[PDB]
């Protein structure tokens, strides 16, 4: 059980990766390349009103 199960990652690299993933989420070709069905989505990034 004392095998090394968990991996320590630098918080800066975690935040960098999160920023890169957020930037890739605003790229409509990558959404299609990841298998998502976004052909009827009006705009990327899709922002809906907070009143709804």
Partner RNA sequence: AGAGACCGAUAGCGCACAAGUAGAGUGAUCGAAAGAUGAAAAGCACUUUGAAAAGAGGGUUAAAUAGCACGUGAAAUUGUUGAAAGGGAAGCGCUUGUGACCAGACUUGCGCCCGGCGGAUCAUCCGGUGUUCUCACCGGUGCACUCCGCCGGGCUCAGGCCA
Partner RNA sequence: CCGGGACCGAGGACCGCGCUCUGCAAGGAUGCUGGCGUAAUGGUCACCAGCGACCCGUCUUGAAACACGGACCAAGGAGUCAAGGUUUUGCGCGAGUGUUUGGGUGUAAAACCCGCACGCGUAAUGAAAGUGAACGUAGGUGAGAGCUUCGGCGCAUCAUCGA
Partner RNA sequence: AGACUAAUCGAACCAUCUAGUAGCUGGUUACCGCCGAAGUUUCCCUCAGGAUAGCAGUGUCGACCUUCAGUUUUAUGAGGU
Partner RNA sequence: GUCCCACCCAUACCCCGCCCUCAGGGUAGAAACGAUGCCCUGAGGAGUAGGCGGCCGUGGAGGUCAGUGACGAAGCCUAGGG
* Residues 26 and 44 sit within 8 Å (Cβ to Cβ): yes
Cβ neighbours of 28 (radius 10 Å): 15
Nearer residue to RNA within complex by CB, 2 or 47 = 2
Among 21, 37, 42, 48, binds RNA (CB under 7 A): 37
Q: Does 34 bind RNA (CB under 7 A)?
A: yes
Is 33 exposed, middle or buried, given 0-12, 13-18 or 19+ CB atoms closer than 10 A?
exposed
Nearer residue to other proteins within complex by CB, 17 or 32 = 32
Query: Which residues contribute to the site for other proteins (CB under 8 A)?
Result: 23-24, 26-35, 38-44
């Amino acid at each position: 059980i004392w095998r090394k199960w968990h991996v320590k990652i630098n918080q800066g690299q975690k935040r960098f990766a999160t920023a890169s993933a957020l930037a890739a989420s605003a790229v409509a070709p990558l959404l299609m390349a990841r298998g998502h069905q976004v052909s009827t989505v009006p705009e990327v990034p899709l922002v809906v009103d907070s009143a709804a």
